[PDB]
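pasting input
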Amino acid sequence: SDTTIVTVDHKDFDRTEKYLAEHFQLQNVDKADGHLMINAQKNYQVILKALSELDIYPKYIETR
Amino acid sequence: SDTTIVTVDHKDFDRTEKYLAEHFQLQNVDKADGHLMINAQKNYQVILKALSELDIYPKYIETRKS
């Protein structure tokens, strides 16, 4: 029942928030620290590619 | 967390391996499973941008104790 946390630059948070809300199952957000928690992605390729197309590159990505 | 592991498609392994060795401390490798181990990375942006420019997107990336 694990979860995937994406961490981005503050300047990328709003667009990352918008994209993940529209394209994945967005659960929690912690804007102060730049974290967004979505349903676990076993393979990161699709999310990393889509964010790259927005010129967004995560500071971090991890699965609890 | 001692090390960062980058996992790619077999397709991307050689090019990813060349990139990681040129910019980081490439340590162990597992070509069969697509794993490349480098010194631990606190911030993933530099690696992800560089690989994105090569149209390479990791299957996985993680920082474990090793």
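fyi Chain A has two helices and four strands.
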